[PDB]
């Protein structure tokens, strides 16, 4: 589900990935949103690549990294899986997801005047 | 431009022991079934060619003795005959070059 990552703040629009093709005029700067639309794995791959130690083992390590844009995973990879790591960020619930019991449990904060359009 | 640093023996070995520089093994060498000599497939057997060249040189020395002078190329065919050979019917009217040795087996 690397396609469904979430960026805090306006990083989708502000974070810029810079590359150079080597040729003159070959400097390419692409926002995170554009890079994500192009490759749904690039953002996570680049984050991991930047966090890994900058030595010759880094690409051997990156060979052990398997990124899949969506829920689908190859059968052999699935059979290899051993453990699932807890998600680092707990996803906040939406109102549509809150139960009526929970809504009721939360107190009403204020008395709205009756004569108000709302 | 002059070299900026002496090239090490390690670099030099990597260069001058490259396969591109190594001599390639030839695989077109075989044995001449006639005489059993080594030859390349597309080239004439060296030994057989040497035989033919020596015999040709002897025949040409005889031709030169017969002609006796520059610019004496005959206007008629030539036939080489060895000891114990006689001009055949078709050998008539052709200059005869006589060789003192016997007819070589490879010469027909």
């Amino acid at each position: 589900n690397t396609r469904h990552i979430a960026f805090s703040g306006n990083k989708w629009e502000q974070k810029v990935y810079s590359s150079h093709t080597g040729y003159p005029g070959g400097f390419r700067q692409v926002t995170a949103a554009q890079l994500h639309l192009r490759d749904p794995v690039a953002i996570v791959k680049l984050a991991i690549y930047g966090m890994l130690p900058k030595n010759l083992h880094r690409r051997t390590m990156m060979e052990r990294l398997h990124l899949f844009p969506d829920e689908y995973i190859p059968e052999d990879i699935l059979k290899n899986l051993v453990e699932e790591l807890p998600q680092p960020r707990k996803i906040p619930k939406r109102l549509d997801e809150y139960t009526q019991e929970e809504i009721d449990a939360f107190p009403r904060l204020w008395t709205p005047p009756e004569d108000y359009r709302l | 431009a002059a070299p900026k640093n002496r090239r090490t023996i390690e670099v030099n070995r990597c260069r001058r022991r490259n396969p591109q520089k190594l001599i390639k093994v030839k695989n077109n060498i075989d044995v001449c079934p006639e005489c059993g000599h080594l030859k390349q497939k597309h080239v004439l057997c060296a030994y057989c060619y040497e035989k033919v060249c020596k015999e040709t040189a002897e025949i040409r020395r005889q031709i030169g003795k017969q002609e006796g002078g520059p610019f004496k190329a005959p206007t008629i065919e030539t036939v080489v005959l060895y000891t114990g050979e006689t001009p055949s019917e078709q050998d008539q009217g052709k200059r005869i070059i006589e060789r003192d040795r016997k007819r070589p087996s490879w010469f027909t």
Binding site: I73, L78, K79, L81, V82, E83, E84 | -
Partner: protein
């Protein structure tokens, strides 16, 4: 340097301390000159200290040659077969005494870099860590995202 030198692991000869301690030095051979200032200290050692050392170390056979070759020496042969030759050239009596005692207390193993200051044949009692220690199991051993 370590990279330019051989290295070994800490070890004893035959588990030298488990059942009993066996002195690994078994032979000392002192080649000493009757004449020559180089072996004056060795001569004094033979006169004043070799007998006491011998009776202190009954397991070590000590030979005194009184006819050296190229320098006065002490050759120490250990049970494991190692032979350590030390020149006693121009050494005082006390220097020779300390050197001989060092040879006596030392084992035949090479004096090279020792990789670890410790050596356990049984490093683990509770079980060496493997990735599955501390990992909980799941019902029917179902791997993550497994349908059944």
């Amino acid at each position: 340097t370590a990279r330019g030198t051989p290295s070994r692991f800490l070890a004893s000869v035959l588990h030298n301390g488990l059942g009993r301690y066996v002195q690994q030095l078994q032979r000392l051979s002192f080649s000493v000159s009757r004449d020559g200032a180089s072996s004056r200290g060795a001569r004094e050692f033979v006169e004043r200290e070799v007998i006491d050392f011998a009776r202190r170390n009954p397991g070590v056979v000590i030979y005194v040659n009184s006819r050296p070759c190229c320098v006065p020496r002490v050759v120490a042969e250990y049970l494991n077969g190692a032979v350590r030759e030390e020149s006693i050239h121009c050494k005082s009596v006390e220097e020779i005494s300390t050197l001989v005692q060092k040879l006596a207390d030392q084992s035949g193993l090479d004096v090279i870099r020792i990789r670890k200051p410790f050596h356990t044949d049984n490093p683990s009692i509770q079980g060496q860590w493997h990735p599955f220690t501390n990992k909980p199991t799941t019902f029917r051993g179902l791997r993550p995202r497994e349908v059944q």
